[model samples]
Target chain A: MEFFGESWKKHLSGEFGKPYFIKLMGFVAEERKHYTVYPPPHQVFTWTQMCDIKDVKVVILGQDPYHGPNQAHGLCFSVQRPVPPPPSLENIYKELSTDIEDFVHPGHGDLSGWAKQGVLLLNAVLTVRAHQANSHKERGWEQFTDAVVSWLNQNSNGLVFLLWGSYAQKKGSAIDRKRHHVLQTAHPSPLSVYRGFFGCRHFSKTNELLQKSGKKPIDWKELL
Target chain B: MTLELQLKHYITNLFNLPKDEKWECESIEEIADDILPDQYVRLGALSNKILQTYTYYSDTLHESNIYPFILYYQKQLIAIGYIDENHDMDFLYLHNTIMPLLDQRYLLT
Candidate 1:
């Protein structure tokens, strides 16, 4: 479907081009022929598509893409322009308000500003069926995403890793704690907010660590 | 040792408070328990920054043998210190809460 851009193609066309992703592409292609899939066709790779590997400063891992219509847009916890932001995103804004005193919350949930600022919001399962959550859990997307995270772990050091909730936290094993900042917290879902996710202060923490490493700190207020 | 002296020594030992720094403590008045979460989160931001003035709670500690006390530096929280009857430091809240949040950093950009 030519979903991947040149930067993504450059990374995915090598050993990542094995039969796994080919079969996965075939499965997604056939699925698209019959049923409607999330993130539309063009926006599926929006995260990696827009964010170059070299520009990635922080990686926030999510479990799956939103299963609702017009909700998923490749970046985890982010929706398209017109759709209302989900609960987790609202809580993210709440935390941002406290983190950056000057932050002004955005009207929409599109986190393209974060992506533009080098925050790679990735979902483990990239696609899901409407109204059915975790539909793509065991799909081949895990292999691709695992490779993506592993690639970042190997190529990038001093990156900020925000592993929210248990599902995202499971991927923390792949991160090199000696070479990166890995912040693990409860998911920002309404169900887990009381468990320390509501005020994790990860946004400022990410920039703080970046500044400590002598790198230009990303303006985390972009999403707000 | 005095309560203040013990706290200063423990603070320096555990958090390694900036060198040659004179520790000052201020009273934040009687704050209720429900608002501790927001207070904790807000104060936790300045984990390692130099503190010009230290903020402390006045007798609002959790009613327990451990006697948890909230301390803030320059309006930023240093950590929640649990003191025994002897005023010796038992445990610091940042170990379980705030410090871990900052220690998450592992590498460069």
Candidate 2:
């Protein structure tokens, strides 16, 4: 239980016990016996423990974990450290710099600071094979994450959702938008960032929405 | 010929299985539009960030390729077929025996 944290959890306390989730864990364990898995074992729930589920003020949805070795750390669009920022994250920082005055690029790609400040850096599928993209998808992670979204939408308000690309954006479209600010942009992948992601000021806009809602604004400047 | 027979022919020709070699089409089923949210399953551990690594002939590709299908072989082979507008087999996936070769599962997920 300490690996998942004690405070942030309210509704998802029993998720690991569900039959589907148990099966997923079993399958992942089976996968690890033969192949190297990403994010290590305990880091799979790093995001959950990093940000309290109840204290969550913002949610940034990513499709899945980065597939390269030493890239995924259970946080969406974030790596642990020293693994240079992936292209999409680079584009995200580019947008941040343009959107916020004096927002310096940290030159590293760790977003745990935002998570500590209640930014839920959630990937729909938390784990991936060593280098297989979307390989862990549809393995019951989607269903588990949907419950998280459903829980937050029903119990929380004044939230800001930064949804990018077709997969993450389409999922966010189904939620209650009246109580939250849903910002949609093309995925920050260089292939489509010019399509709208670069100009999409989700960071500044997220801060503004939270400030107006009487919540603490995220310090986008810090990303260690 | 039906899509199944045609796909069998395509796979046979693609692999060039010799006479007396046993290769049978287990089944051929169409994938419904929303069965899987993501199209274009990557073949290997290739990154989907920029470069697509699935090796299908580009010339035979059709718009109908977006609608995928499953072509199962009697062996441990699961093929993902992209049918063309002319009802021809446009693309296929069964490259290796699944169980022993440790091939990636190329089915709808």
Candidate 3:
């Protein structure tokens, strides 16, 4: 019952029917045996539990779950205890510090505070195998996540979308630009960080847009 | 030919159409301008050159001569792609590549 949370079950019931849920159950059952699945099996619905559909003011799209042991606790770019934060998360901290002057980089990369404040940190492929990236590419997860993105595009208005990297940007095409504020940039990964990602100032920009729309602004510093 | 018209010519050639080819190339303005009004600007500097050894990564992890024209906008270089016969366009999905000139445009927002 990954999506059994009251908020998520209600929100997802309309778009994802019984078949989708059953398919997800099948994936969980299948993946539990051989490979090391991310977010443990229970935490797969972590993002959904953090924010309700209507509460999602900002959406930060990511490619896949982190492919290392003890990394990727369902939220995009987040990891659990002992495992150090990835390079991409470190760069994200750099950008966050630059964007929000009061913000200090955290010692650990548990981003649950951002999620609780309505930043829907969604990864396109929610699960990955340890030390093997894109291991579940052809699985049914993409279909489920695509449906989630499409659902958000239709239901939410004036949401700010932080589409980092090509994979995330591709999913953003479904977003109605007229209604939403989409900020695209290179991935915070070390390889592409030089290509207009460092000075992007997406955090402050997202907050400013939310303020203009009469929505609550996320205090990026408060998370630290 | 204008740069935009030249883009049409290059695209027609990339798709391997006859010299008297006929195809509808959608205007970049229609697709990209409204999507990111702050980011999209008029092409600044333009040049025409035979770009051999031009670097455009294909899904097969190889580079080819997809460079037809290069334009400068807001101090950044944007290369217009030319398809090679060896390239398989299927794996190279339009959304993954050949999208739009999007960059940092949120300083005021």
Candidate 4:
């Protein structure tokens, strides 16, 4: 019948890859309209193309939208992630730039080399008709979760989950009750970094895990 | 979708009141998912605060994604929170989710 929702449909880039459109369990039809907290062109990403391997070694989950303009970028997740960073980033720069070095920030590109080394960097809300918080709560995310769980069951062989925050970590747990090594932590935002978001120095842990795994050096060069 | 009834269920349980089975159920199937104004409800818990501030790309996100551990109270709504517009972040409206009440169920206090 009708597509998921206007806000959600907008982000779903009609691209398909190794991530097959698996069976669907539930969906919301003619759901209520929703409100957006940020500006637009919020980029909606799909792992279909990025996740080529049947099972990945790692998966990264974060909240939605780096910025609220021109669709959230498909690259790293940050307000400065877009090509022309939003004014919010400028404000952050003026106030906290000295504290952050990766000025290019998290959104403009993919997961450094995490993808090549079989890591999936994704937001909890993968797709939607619009960038709305309420609509997402009502029906948008549930529809996507059902599919993600199904996909993980079929996939996830020798993999670990790098989940952040209660939302992603909880969802990851639901995806596979007795599955992958899902490491939970706080959000990866500068806000988190400065405040010690989850209190467990994730950045250091990220490097530690990568080095410890010894997975083929993660072709960071070819990934971009 | 229609959480009003569920809200009533929680209330009834807390008070140990008889279930309100006499109430009729209805929903505005076309209503947008915008939260009712704050005048209509209030929220508690840091998680709820974060969700109110954060935006979502899809709905499949867990309930925690939209709502945190805050306990919600309402005259009739199961959930209560503030609604704001993007054009003016400073601008906000109060809203509540109204649940159905059984015809014979009345608080005698």
- Against the true structure, whose TM-score is highest? 2
- Clashing residue pairs for model 1: A104-A224, A158-B107, A158-B108, A179-B107, A180-B106, A180-B107, A181-B105, A181-B106, B43-B77
lDDT of each: 0.64, 0.64, 0.61, 0.36
A106, model 2: CA deviation in Å?
A: 0.8
Model 4 residue A205 CA deviation (Å) reads 3.0
Taking all chains together, each candidate's TM-score versus the true structure is 0.65, 0.67, 0.65, 0.45
lDDT of 4: 0.36
Sorted by TM-score (best first), the order is 2, 1, 3, 4
* Candidate 4 positional error at A57, Å: 2.2
Can you write out model 1's per-residue Cα lDDT over A7-66, one digit (the tens) per residue?
A: 766765664467887888788778788778887888898986776768889899887787
Expressed as tens digits, the lDDT of each residue in A1-224 for candidate 2 is 44676664556867878999899888888989988888788888788888667889999887777666677887888876666666567668889889988988897888888888889988888777874555786898898888888888898998999888767876687778788889887766543455678788888888889989999899888763
Task: Provide DockQ values for all models, in the order shown.
Answer: 0.01, 0.03, 0.02, 0.03
Error of 2 at B54 (Å): 11
Better of 2 and 3 by DockQ: 2
Tell me the spans in candidate 2 whose CA falls farther than 4 Å from its real position.
B1-109
Query: TM-score of candidate 2 restricted to chain B?
Result: 0.26
Query: What is the lDDT, from 0 to 100, of the residue A209 in candidate 1?
Result: 95
Angstrom error of the Cα, residue A214, model 4: value is 5.5
| Candidate 3 residue pairs in clash (backbone atoms < 3 Å) | B66-B82
TM-score of structure candidate 2: 0.67
